[PDB]
Design a protein around this ligand. Structure first.
Ligand code: ATX
Length: 313
C-alpha cells in the first residue's frame, strides 16, 4: 500500500492578522512553483501537524496548511469569539489572496470535508478539485449518532466515562451539558470536561485501539479541541438548514472530486458519504473495507495518496 512521502520542513510560515481579533498560523510546503493546494484540518479545533505536509508530492504540489481560529498556533488559543464556519471560509480566502493563488485543490477530511464543502459552495471558481475523506455534513442525525446515542452502543464502556460527570437530566442532551461545563468561569471545570470529550473521540477514530489516543488528553489540545468542537455543534455548524451542504451540491458538481470513507468509521457514518455521492454522481466514491475514521488507516491513506498523485500526474 502507498504511504506518506518522507518528512520535509515547510519553506515559509507566518501569522495572518484577521483584523477582528485573531492571528492565524499558516505555512507553505513543497514546491513554490508547484500546483496549489490547501489542507483543511478536522475537529473543528484539531490543528495541523508536520505529517500533513507529507500527503502531497513535494515536487508537484505547493501546499498551504493553516491552523483554524483558536487552535494549534493560531491566537488567541481556545477562543470562541468570532469563531464560526463563515469566518473560517473568509479566512481561507485571505490566505488564498496572500499566497497569490487564483485557484487550488481543496483537501479535507472529517470536519475538514465539512468546511471544504462550505468553502467550495461559497467560492466555486476558486476550487480546481477536491479530495474528501470521512464525510461530515453536520446534519442533526450525524451529531446525534456521535454524541447522544449511536457510536455509544459500539463503545458502551467508553461512553459510560463520558456520562460519569453528568446528572440524569443532563444525559438527555450531552452536547448541551458539556457546553455548560466547557464555558464555565471555572477553568478546572472546563478542563475536566474537555479531557473526557476529547478522549472519547481519540479512542473511537481508529479501527483498532492505539496508544496515540492518549495525546487527546493533553490539557492545551483538549481544551481548545473540546471547546471549539462543542461550540460548532451547539450552533449546528452555523448552517441555515439541516441539509444545507447536501442541498447546495449542484453548485460544485462540475468540480472533480474523490471521496474516501472507511466502512467502520464510527465518527462519521458511511451513510454521509453515500448521501453525498448520491447527489454528486460525477464524484468518485471509495468505501474502504476494514477501516475506521482516521486518515492514516492503511486502506484510507492508500486511497488518499493515489488521489493526490492522480490530480498531479
Ligand atoms: C468531526 C470530527 N471530530 C473531526 O473533524 C476530526 N477530528 N479528528 C479528525 C482526524 C480524523 C482528521 C484526526 O477528524
Amino acid at each position: 500500500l502507498r504511504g506518506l512521502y518522507p518528512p520535509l520542513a515547510a519553506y515559509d510560515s507566518g501569522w495572518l492578522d484577521t483584523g477582528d481579533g485573531h492571528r492565524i498560523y499558516w505555512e507553505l510546503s513543497g514546491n513554490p512553483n508547484g500546483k496549489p493546494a490547501v489542507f483543511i484540518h478536522g475537529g473543528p479545533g484539531g490543528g495541523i501537524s508536520p505529517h500533513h505536509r507529507q500527503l502531497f508530492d513535494p515536487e508537484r504540489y505547493k501546499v498551504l496548511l493553516f491552523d483554524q481560529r483558536g487552535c494549534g498556533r493560531s491566537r488567541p488559543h481556545a477562543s470562541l469569539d468570532n469563531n464560526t464556519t463563515w469566518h473560517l471560509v473568509a479566512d481561507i480566502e485571505r490566505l488564498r489572496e496572500m499566497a497569490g493563488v487564483e485557484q487550488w485543490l481543496v483537501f479535507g477530511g472529517s470536519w475538514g470535508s465539512t468546511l471544504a464543502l462550505a468553502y467550495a459552495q461559497t467560492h466555486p471558481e476558486r476550487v480546481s478539485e477536491m479530495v474528501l475523506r470521512g464525510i461530515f455534513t453536520l446534519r442533526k442525525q450525524r451529531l446525534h449518532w456521535y454524541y447522544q446515542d449511536g457510536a455509544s452502543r459500539f463503545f458502551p464502556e467508553k461512553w459510560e466515562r463520558v456520562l460519569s460527570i453528568l446528572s440524569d437530566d443532563e444525559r438527555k442532551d450531552v452536547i448541551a451539558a458539556y457546553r455548560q461545563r466547557l464555558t464555565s468561569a471555572d477553568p478546572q471545570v472546563q478542563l475536566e470536561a474537555a479531557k473526557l470529550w476529547s478522549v472519547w473521540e481519540g479512542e473511537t477514530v481508529t479501527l483498532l485501539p492505539s496508544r496515540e489516543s492518549a495525546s487527546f488528553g493533553e490539557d492545551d489540545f483538549a481544551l481548545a479541541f473540546a471547546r471549539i468542537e462543542n461550540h460548532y455543534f451547539t450552533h449546528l455548524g452555523f448552517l441555515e438548514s439541516d441539509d444545507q451542504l447536501l442541498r447546495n451540491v449542484p453548485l460544485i458538481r462540475h468540480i472533480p472530486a474523490v471521496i474516501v470513507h472507511g466502512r467502520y468509521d464510527m465518527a462519521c457514518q458511511v451513510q454521509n458519504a453515500w448521501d453525498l455521492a448520491k447527489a454528486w454522481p460525477e464524484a468518485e466514491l471509495h468505501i474502504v473495507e476494514g477501516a475506521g475514521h482516521s486518515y492514516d488507516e492503511p486502506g484510507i491513506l492508500h486511497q488518499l495518496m493515489i488521489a493526490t498523485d492522480r490530480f498531479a500526474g
